[PDB]
């Protein structure tokens, strides 16, 4: 292959932070970079190249069955390993992320058309609310 | 109901940062997330769950009426309270944000196809230009 | 003109970091904001304004012809001047970036299905893979 015409969506990206530490790129910018995924747009006429690099934030997938213990690696937040276990309490999904931080977990439940999430760690409680699309 | 299937768009997020500090998440990451809105995709079959979760940069709304003060809380920037007043000067919105920073305000005007915005704080001026599409 | 209705997409943004320095914005937030492009949707009629400001990550453009030296201001990364050259080698675009960092450059090619990118600085490599859409 010698022609690249099209829009290319990135699927893998290794040692990005290593490359940037080799460029002495500062730590805040690096924490930005490692959460991004790229899609480059490339048009070629002969040896002539037009390319544009585009970003958007990385997506994060947590899969589980209720009642089955599983290892979660908490990328997207604190990058810790935890034994996550999800259970029903009424119609409220309750997960406990057993591990290094005490009293760490989250509850989730639907009321009317809205989703309700409580994320807990120690003393602290974050309360989020969602609308269905 | 124990059916969580669908796409759920966040609309409220209290104490995200308390939750993140309690996980000992570094300052820069705490500043990245905090500007984000979150839409969670959930595919549930009985007790089997897949969640995909996506993040976008949070929107920032300012609505005002000219010649009447209003309360700007400068999220997306410095997180300060200011009392803003937008007056006319010919066809130029001129706004002063009384508050802590002396000589803080902005100016906004249309010149043909383009919108011009000069943001001022003390000795520093930032000039932005927007094409109408 | 006194009418501002429309969606306006940013095109230029000078002294943004200076304005943010005057406002005492913490370093990480500055390093985030300076990487953004903004679109303002404005709704008017009268003196009653409704503005929604939205942000996305700024694109980063690199245009060249295979063989012609060109200066790069590595804006998306370490903010450095390099003199870049891109050559064919077989079916593989081979760019070198002469400048302050030894062994800086990248290699880019397609393997039927997918696009392959390899950035090198010093002895460090970053390896990326894109699927065509
Ligand atoms: Zn985005
Ligand atoms: Zn929100
Ligand atoms: Zn920092
Ligand atoms: Zn960011
Ligand atoms: Zn971001
Ligand atoms: Zn972002």
Ligand in nearest proximity to the CA of C56: 1
Name the residue of chain C whose CA is nearest to A44's CA: C65
Query: Contact C13/B115 with Cβ under 8 angstroms?
Result: no
- Shortest distance between the Cα of B71 and any Cα of chain C, in A, equals 14
Name every residue whose Cβ is closer than 8 Å to that of residue C46 and which is 6 or more positions away in sequence.
none
Q: What is the DSSP string of C21-82?
A: HHTT--HHHHHHHTTEEEEEEEE-STTEEEEEEEEEEPPEEEEEETT--EEEEETTTT-EEE
Q: State in Å: Cα B27 to ligand 6 middle.
A: 16
Report the distance separating Cα A116 and Cα A119, nearest Å. 10
Is C6's Cβ below 8 Å from some Cβ in B? yes
**Chains with ≥3 CB–CB distances under 8 Å to C:** A, B
List the domain range (segments joined by +) for residue A58.
1-133
Number of domains comprising chain B? 1
Residues in chain C: 133
Judged by CB atoms within 8 Å, which residues 51-70 of A form the interface with C?
51-56
Long-range (24+ apart) CB contacts under 8 A made by B62-68 are B62/C49, B62/C51, B62/C53, B63/C48, B63/C49, B63/C50, B63/C51, B64/C49, B65/C47, B65/C48, B65/C49, B66/B93, B66/C47, B66/C49, B67/C47
Query: Contact A100/A80 with Cβ under 8 angstroms?
Result: yes
Q: State in Å: Cα C57 to ligand 1 middle.
A: 6
Closest CA to B119 of B132, B110, B128: B128
Query: Contact B95/B85 with Cβ under 8 angstroms?
Result: yes
Residues of C in contact with A48 (CB under 8 A): 65
Helix, coil or strand: residue A130: strand
Name every residue whose Cβ is closer than 8 Å to that of residue C23 and which is 6 or more positions away in sequence.
B77, B78, B101, B104, B121
Residue B58 gets which letter from DSSP?
Answer: P
If you compute the radius of gyration of chain A from its CA atoms, what whole number of angstroms results? Answer: 21
A-B CB pairs within 8 A amount to: 114
* Phi and psi at residue C19, to the nearest 5°: -55, -40
Mutation to test the A interface, candidates C91, C124, C125, most A Cβ within 10 Å: C124
Is B125's Cβ below 8 Å from some Cβ in C? yes
Cα angle vertex A17, ends A13, A21, to 5°? 145
């Amino acid at each position: 292959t010698r022609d690249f015409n099209g829009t290319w969506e990135m699927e893998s990206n290794e040692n990005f932070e290593g490359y940037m530490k080799a460029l002495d790129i500062d730590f805040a910018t690096r924490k930005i970079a490692v959460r991004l995924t790229f899609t480059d747009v490339i048009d070629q006429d002969g040896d002539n190249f037009k390319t544009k690099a585009t970003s958007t934030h990385l997506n994060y997938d947590v899969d589980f069955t209720v009642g089955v213990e599983f290892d979660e690696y908490t990328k997207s937040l604190d990058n810790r390993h935890v034994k996550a276990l999800v259970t029903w309490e009424g119609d409220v999904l309750v997960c406990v992320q057993k591990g290094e931080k005490e009293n760490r977990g989250w509850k989730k439940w639907i009321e009317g058309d809205k989703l309700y999430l409580e994320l807990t760690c120690g003393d602290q409680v974050c309360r989020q609310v969602f609308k269905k699309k």
